[PDB]
Amino acid sequence: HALFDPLTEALNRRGCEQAMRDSVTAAQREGWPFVLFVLDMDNLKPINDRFGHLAGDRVLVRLVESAYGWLGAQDWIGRWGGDEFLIGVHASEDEATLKLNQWLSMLEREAPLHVSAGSAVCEVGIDATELYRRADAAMYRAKFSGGRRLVRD
């Protein structure tokens, strides 16, 4: 399906781009809060080497399925590509971040998944590209400081 990743059923790259545009438009038109997360796996390659790529595929599927487990009606999760994902949550930073962190903590428990993540909060007067740039930059700070963490913009 267009806009959807065949393996995980999360949105695909073009799905992510459209979702970001629609979520930012919604925040600015409906007044809804919006937090964008950029996630990059830290240990999928070693999981693939140790248990095989099918095990790795399962890990990605689990990641997305479990996310759909707490994401709301207007929320979303998309696969940017490879082992990199984006998550859009229409809630306060407090709520969004607490749920995301608890979710990531749960995933560190069958092959444990380690994730580097960054977040950015939608604000009036910002466009989707700039929001993405902020969340993306935060993710790299998380990544290079060791991973297995969420750094806020």
Ligand X SMILES: Nc1nc2c(ncn2[C@@H]2O[C@@H]3COP(=O)(O)O[C@H]4[C@@H](O)[C@H](n5cnc6c(=O)[nH]c(N)nc65)O[C@@H]4COP(=O)(O)O[C@H]3[C@H]2O)c(=O)[nH]1
* Residues at the contact surface with ligand X, assessed by CB under 6 A: 7, 13, 44-45, 48, 53, 56-57, 60, 80-84
Asked whether 114 and 108 are in contact (CB, 8 A), the reply is yes
Residue 62: how many other CB atoms lie within 10 Å: 15
Q: How wide is the angle at C-alpha 149 spanned by C-alphas 147 and 150, nearest 5°?
A: 125
The CB-nearest residue to ligand X is 81
Contacts of 23 (CB under 8 A, 6+ apart): 34, 36, 74, 76, 88, 90, 122, 128
Q: Does 83 bind Mg ion (CB under 5 A)?
A: yes
Name the pairing type of β-strands 115-121 and 35-41: antiparallel
Query: Contacts with its own copies: how many residues (CB under 8 A)?
Result: 4
Q: Residue 9: which of its own copies, Mg ion, ligand X, none does it interact with, CB under 5 to 8 A by kind?
A: none
Residue whose pair of structure tokens reads 């069958």 in the numeric block = 110
Q: Does 40 bind Mg ion (CB under 5 A)?
A: yes
Binding pattern for the stretch 111-150 against its own copies, x by CB under 8 A and - elsewhere: ----------------------x----------x------
Binding interface with its own copies (CB under 8 A): 49, 82, 133, 144
Binding interface with Mg ion (CB under 5 A): 40, 83-84
